């Protein structure tokens, strides 16, 4: 719980191949639908809009 | 999911906010290209028919 109100949250799990298993967390900028890869990457671009 | 050709990658996103929350979707992704395909159906057609 850090994440503004309209953001969209996923998991990608991997079925297939070496790295079958893995789950990715993913989120998603309300409106744009703009595809993020971490906390960070989010966290960095509220400051940097 | 043996019907695949060799190299083709799967996964499932799972929604995990909103109304959608729990939704299941089958990806799947051709070599190299990272072309994006949603069914098996969808798949067999672009082999077939490129």
């Given amino acids: 719980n850090w994440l503004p ?3 969209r949250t996923e998991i990608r799990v991997r ?8 789950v990715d967390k993913f989120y ?3 409106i744009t639908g703009r595809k993020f890869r971490s906390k ?3 966290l ?3 400051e940097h809009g």
Avoid: H, I
């Fill in 5 to 7: 109100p309209d953001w």
């Fill in 44 to 46: 960095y671009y509220l």
């Fill in 15 to 22: 079925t297939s191949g070496t790295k079958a298993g893995t």
């Fill in 28 to 30: 998603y900028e309300p």
């Fill in 40 to 42: 960070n990457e989010v």
